[PDB]
Amino acid sequence: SRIEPTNRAVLLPLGLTPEQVSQARPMSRALFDALPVGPELLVPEVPNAGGPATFPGAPGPIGTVIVTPQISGPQQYSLVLGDGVQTLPPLVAQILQNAAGNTKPLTVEPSTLAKMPVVNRLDLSAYPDNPLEVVDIREHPST
Amino acid sequence: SRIEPTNRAVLLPLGLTPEQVSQARPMSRALFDALPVGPELLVPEVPNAGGPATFPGAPGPIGTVIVTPQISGPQQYSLVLGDGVQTLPPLVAQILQNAGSAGNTKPLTVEPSTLAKMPVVNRLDLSAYPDNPLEVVDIREHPST
């Protein structure tokens, strides 16, 4: 999956550094063809951000982020889609929380959030669960 | 590598103590010649310190330490040079603050959106220092090397 050096918004949550991105070692043309391609590691774009929602009871316009606490376990983050909401993992939410944007998401009650319709339309496959454990090539010269 | 007992700014972050260093045991001439010499453990000499930056929007004078807020992910320290900023390892940032204190005790906190505009530059060598505290061996239990 492709990455860029200037995009502090995606590097900072992921744990990468611009130097560590620009100074990486070369790769053979043969290995580059064997590996299947993933999407760009970029801030996931939301279509028609700021528009009105299709469903009743929506806490806000398209592209806004909503969060609800729990009695136990972590807080459940979510984003407003055109036809509903989709739950997002913490690391994905941290990407969106960086542009400036709002200082905090819309806080809401668990029951109303459970009553709203859930949709799945934005791809999360490329983003991980925790900061990446980047292998230091000087000690591991082969892949 | 050489180190001096008067430089409290470097002894403390590494995990050394002035008395401990002064009471170190002898070394034979035979072993002194065998070991290769490495660069000295001293405070990094940042060039042209204190002047204004060339690039726009610089958060402070050349040589100030910058950090980013913890809410946006693991904190990355950096140094502002004349033409841009270069990253710093955690252990070295502590030495620059302690030595370059002159009464100041903390860095300037800046957000990612304003940080991303600053150009990246690499103009000083910093690979000598380790990335974590020194596990100094208590010589009474290991008198041979």
Side-chain angles (χ1 to χ4, degrees), chain B residues 8-31:
Chain B
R8 283 183 172 269
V10 180
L11 292 167
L12 182 64
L14 263 57
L16 273 53
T17 311
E19 187 63 23
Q20 175 198 16
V21 166
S22 77
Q23 300 297 348
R25 275 53 166 184
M27 191 172 202
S28 180
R29 173 176 278 156
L31 182 62

Side-chain angles (χ1 to χ4, degrees), chain B residues 8-15 43-44 65-67 75 77-78 88-101 104-107 126 129-133:
Chain B
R8 283 183 172 269
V10 180
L11 292 167
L12 182 64
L14 263 57
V43 180
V65 185
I66 295 164
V67 73
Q75 303 191 261
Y77 295 92
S78 52
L88 292 174
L91 189 148
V92 192
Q94 297 173 27
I95 296 167
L96 280 169
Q97 290 174 28
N98 200 314
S101 173
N104 183 43
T105 59
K106 283 188 180 181
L126 222 62
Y129 314 91
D131 66 14
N132 66 93

Side-chain angles (χ1 to χ4, degrees), chain A residues 5-9 12-13 15-19 23 94 97-100 103 131, chain B residues 68-69 71-76 85 87 111-113 115-118 120-122:
Chain A
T6 304
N7 196 311
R8 289 301 203 297
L12 188 69
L16 274 55
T17 309
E19 189 70 357
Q23 307 297 15
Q94 290 180 19
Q97 183 55 87
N98 286 282
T103 58
Chain B
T68 210
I71 69 176
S72 40
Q75 303 191 261
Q76 314 294 309
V85 308
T87 299
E111 294 184 312
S113 179
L115 171 56
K117 293 186 177 182
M118 304 197 290
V120 181
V121 162
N122 183 336

